Short mmCIF file of C-alpha atoms in Angstrom, two decimals:
data_model
loop_
_atom_site.label_atom_id
_atom_site.label_comp_id
_atom_site.label_asym_id
_atom_site.label_seq_id
_atom_site.Cartn_x
_atom_site.Cartn_y
_atom_site.Cartn_z
CA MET A 242 104.14 107.89 83.96
CA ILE A 243 104.92 104.71 82.01
CA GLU A 244 103.06 101.42 82.20
CA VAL A 245 104.78 98.17 81.24
CA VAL A 246 103.05 94.81 80.93
CA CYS A 247 105.27 91.88 81.90
CA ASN A 248 104.03 89.03 79.71
CA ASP A 249 105.28 85.79 81.23
CA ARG A 250 105.99 83.74 78.13
CA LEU A 251 106.67 80.82 80.48
CA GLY A 252 102.97 80.66 81.29
CA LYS A 253 101.46 83.64 83.10
CA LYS A 254 100.40 87.29 82.84
CA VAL A 255 101.70 89.94 85.25
CA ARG A 256 101.24 93.62 84.42
CA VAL A 257 103.51 96.21 86.04
CA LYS A 258 103.36 99.95 86.64
CA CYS A 259 106.38 102.26 86.56
CA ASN A 260 107.62 105.44 84.85
CA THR A 261 110.32 106.81 82.56
CA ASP A 262 112.20 108.15 85.59
CA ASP A 263 112.40 104.56 86.88
CA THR A 264 115.39 102.39 85.94
CA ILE A 265 115.92 98.79 84.82
CA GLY A 266 117.18 97.67 88.21
CA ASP A 267 114.06 99.08 89.85
CA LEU A 268 111.78 97.39 87.32
CA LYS A 269 113.51 94.05 87.89
CA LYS A 270 112.85 94.40 91.61
CA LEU A 271 109.25 95.46 90.95
CA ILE A 272 108.39 92.02 89.57
CA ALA A 273 110.94 90.02 91.56
CA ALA A 274 109.63 91.62 94.76
CA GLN A 275 106.04 90.67 93.97
CA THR A 276 105.77 87.31 92.22
CA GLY A 277 109.21 86.04 93.21
CA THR A 278 110.77 85.40 89.82
CA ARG A 279 114.26 86.76 90.60
CA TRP A 280 115.95 89.58 88.70
CA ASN A 281 118.92 87.74 87.19
CA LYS A 282 117.74 84.48 85.62
CA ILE A 283 114.58 86.26 84.47
CA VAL A 284 114.77 87.46 80.87
CA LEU A 285 113.17 90.91 80.81
CA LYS A 286 113.65 92.20 77.26
CA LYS A 287 111.23 94.33 75.24
CA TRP A 288 111.32 92.79 71.76
CA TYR A 289 115.08 92.20 72.02
CA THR A 290 117.02 94.88 73.90
CA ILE A 291 119.53 94.55 76.73
CA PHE A 292 117.91 96.21 79.73
CA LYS A 293 120.81 97.63 81.75
CA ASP A 294 120.33 99.22 85.18
CA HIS A 295 122.29 102.28 83.99
CA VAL A 296 119.26 103.71 82.15
CA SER A 297 115.81 105.26 82.59
CA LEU A 298 113.32 103.73 80.14
CA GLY A 299 114.73 105.43 77.07
CA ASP A 300 117.79 103.66 75.68
CA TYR A 301 115.46 100.81 74.67
CA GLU A 302 112.66 103.08 73.41
CA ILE A 303 110.10 102.99 76.23
CA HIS A 304 106.56 104.37 76.08
CA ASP A 305 103.69 104.79 78.54
CA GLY A 306 101.86 101.62 77.54
CA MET A 307 103.82 98.80 75.93
CA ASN A 308 104.37 95.05 76.24
CA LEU A 309 107.62 93.30 77.15
CA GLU A 310 108.80 89.72 76.69
CA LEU A 311 109.39 87.83 79.93
CA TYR A 312 111.14 84.47 79.58
CA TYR A 313 111.70 82.34 82.68
CA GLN A 314 114.66 79.96 82.77
#
């Protein structure tokens, strides 16, 4: 299992729950299909890494309990 906190730099705090097996596309939908912040305009990047759907929480060094930057524009 892998927990990922989606810190809304815009002005909010929304924690998420997923796992290594999960992918970027799924994660994007996890938040988008909850708070309604889309999955395209939303800037979901941990520190500064391009989160591509063709992955599984690994290419960007993912751990079970980390924070991610969430910029809304």
